Design a protein around this motif. Structure first.
Motif, short mmCIF file in Angstrom:
data_model
loop_
_atom_site.label_atom_id
_atom_site.label_comp_id
_atom_site.label_asym_id
_atom_site.label_seq_id
_atom_site.Cartn_x
_atom_site.Cartn_y
_atom_site.Cartn_z
N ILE A 191 0.56 -1.34 0.47
CA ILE A 191 -0.34 0.26 0.10
C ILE A 191 0.91 1.54 0.39
O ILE A 191 2.05 1.16 0.76
CB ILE A 191 -1.00 0.18 0.98
N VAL A 192 0.82 2.75 -0.84
CA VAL A 192 1.74 3.40 -1.17
C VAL A 192 0.20 4.92 -0.85
O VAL A 192 -0.15 5.16 -0.74
CB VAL A 192 2.38 3.32 -2.53
N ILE A 193 1.71 5.36 -0.10
CA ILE A 193 0.90 6.96 0.36
C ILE A 193 1.79 7.70 -0.21
O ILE A 193 2.31 8.79 0.80
CB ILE A 193 0.89 6.68 1.61
N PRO A 194 1.95 8.54 -1.12
CA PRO A 194 2.74 9.43 -1.85
C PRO A 194 2.62 10.66 -1.31
O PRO A 194 1.28 10.71 -1.28
CB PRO A 194 3.09 9.30 -3.68
N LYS A 195 3.37 11.28 -0.72
CA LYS A 195 3.08 12.57 -0.17
C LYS A 195 2.95 13.77 -1.24
O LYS A 195 3.40 15.17 -0.65
CB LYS A 195 3.59 11.93 0.94
N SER A 196 3.16 14.40 -2.54
CA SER A 196 3.71 15.36 -3.23
C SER A 196 2.49 16.31 -3.15
O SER A 196 1.74 15.80 -2.51
CB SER A 196 4.05 15.19 -4.58
N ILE A 197 3.14 17.18 -2.95
CA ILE A 197 2.38 18.94 -2.57
C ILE A 197 1.70 19.49 -3.99
O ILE A 197 1.02 19.97 -4.28
CB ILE A 197 2.52 19.54 -2.04
N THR A 198 2.85 19.53 -4.68
CA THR A 198 1.53 20.22 -6.18
C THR A 198 0.65 19.39 -7.07
O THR A 198 0.91 17.92 -7.63
CB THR A 198 3.10 20.54 -7.04
N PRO A 199 -0.20 19.70 -7.35
CA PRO A 199 -0.97 19.30 -8.17
C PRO A 199 -0.67 18.55 -9.09
O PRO A 199 -1.07 17.20 -9.50
CB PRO A 199 -2.15 20.78 -8.99
N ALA A 200 0.28 18.74 -9.66
CA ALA A 200 0.41 17.72 -11.09
C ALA A 200 1.39 16.48 -10.60
O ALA A 200 1.52 15.98 -10.74
CB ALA A 200 1.95 18.78 -11.93
N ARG A 201 2.50 16.57 -9.40
CA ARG A 201 2.78 15.89 -9.02
C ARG A 201 1.53 14.55 -8.17
O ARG A 201 1.19 13.34 -8.58
CB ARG A 201 3.96 16.02 -8.01
N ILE A 202 0.13 15.55 -7.45
CA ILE A 202 -0.31 14.30 -7.01
C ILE A 202 -1.39 13.54 -8.58
O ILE A 202 -1.57 12.70 -8.11
CB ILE A 202 -1.74 15.62 -6.09
N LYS A 203 -1.90 14.44 -9.40
CA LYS A 203 -2.49 13.56 -10.75
C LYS A 203 -1.27 13.12 -10.91
O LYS A 203 -1.95 11.52 -11.47
CB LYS A 203 -2.44 15.32 -11.18
N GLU A 204 -0.15 12.82 -10.44
CA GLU A 204 1.21 12.49 -11.54
C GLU A 204 1.26 10.85 -10.66
O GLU A 204 1.22 9.25 -11.44
CB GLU A 204 2.39 12.57 -12.30
#
Length: 262
Positions: free
Chosen positions: A228-241
């Motif tokens: 299970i993964v919980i990537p934590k990017s803050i920028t919208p582009a990265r959230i969508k990526e």
């Protein structure tokens, strides 16, 4: 028109958790509101924070104002070290629910096995109670070592659904993953993208081979190894990526090559 179905991991207590979730880390309440809003908009249905990050109000505001039913979102938070103990956990949880503006959490985790086994067992005793009461759907832990898990299972008879641990291609946690598998504990990876390897030639090569980004390859490797993964990017582009990882698969060679990064 195809919509990739986000896989769920069936846990040892019968609950299902979306295999991808959105990690909130030490961001402010206002930032949490925007980020969680963005994640829910991008199609994430699993939101992960921790009480020590001080953003439960904002996480709760984005969730409650998303236009998505509470029942269709999986929400995790975590009991902080200074609140460990039976009564102190019950109090902390109440306070967190009041901040989040909801009457249950899907997953409550003990944040650390600190400062002592006795203290975390009493916290675990309180989690068991919250679970019996139906206010926490699944109970688990974070940053626990094999010795902490052994004591928790032996002393309480109740096995955590998952243990959330730092796990990424340069820190693959082979030992803990072997213990987890052995005892029906799911592995959840925090900081799954690791350390900024965006310039690693193996990962760059695999990203090209598949026409995906290096972050997408890393997150697919996690998905295929059962994390299970919980990537934590803050920028919208990265959230969508980070959400777009269910439209492809790695192969055998790809996996071997990523294993060699540890």
């Amino acid at each position: 028109s195809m919509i990739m179905t986000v896989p769920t991991v069936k846990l040892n207590d019968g609950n299902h958790i979306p295999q991808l979730g959105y990690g909130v880390w030490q961001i402010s309440n206002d930032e949490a509101v925007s980020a969680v809003s963005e994640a829910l908009k991008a199609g994430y249905r699993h939101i992960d924070t921790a009480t020590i990050y001080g953003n439960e109000e904002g996480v709760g505001k984005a969730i409650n104002g998303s236009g998505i039913a509470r029942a269709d979102i999986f929400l995790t938070t975590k009991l902080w070290n200074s609140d460990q103990g039976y009564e102190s956990t019950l109090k902390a949880f109440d306070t967190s629910l009041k901040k989040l503006g909801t009457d249950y959490v899907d997953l409550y985790l003990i944040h650390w096995p600190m400062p002592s086994k006795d203290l975390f067992m009493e916290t675990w005793r309180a989690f068991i109670k919250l679970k019996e009461e139906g206010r926490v759907k699944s109970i688990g832990v974070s940053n626990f070592r094999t010795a902490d898990l052994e004591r928790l299972i032996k002393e309480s008879g109740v096995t955590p659904v998952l243990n959330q641990i730092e796990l990424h291609p340069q820190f693959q946690q082979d030992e803990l993953r072997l213990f987890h598998g052995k005892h029906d504990i799911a592995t959840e990876a925090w900081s799954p993208l690791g350390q900024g390897l965006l310039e690693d030639p193996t990962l760059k090569s695999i990203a090209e081979k598949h026409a995906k980004s290096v972050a997408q390859i890393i997150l697919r490797w996690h998905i295929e190894t059962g994390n299970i993964v919980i990537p934590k990017s803050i920028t919208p582009a990265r959230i969508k990526e980070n959400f777009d990882i269910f439209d492809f698969t790695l192969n055998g060679t790809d996996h071997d090559a990523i294993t060699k990064l540890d």
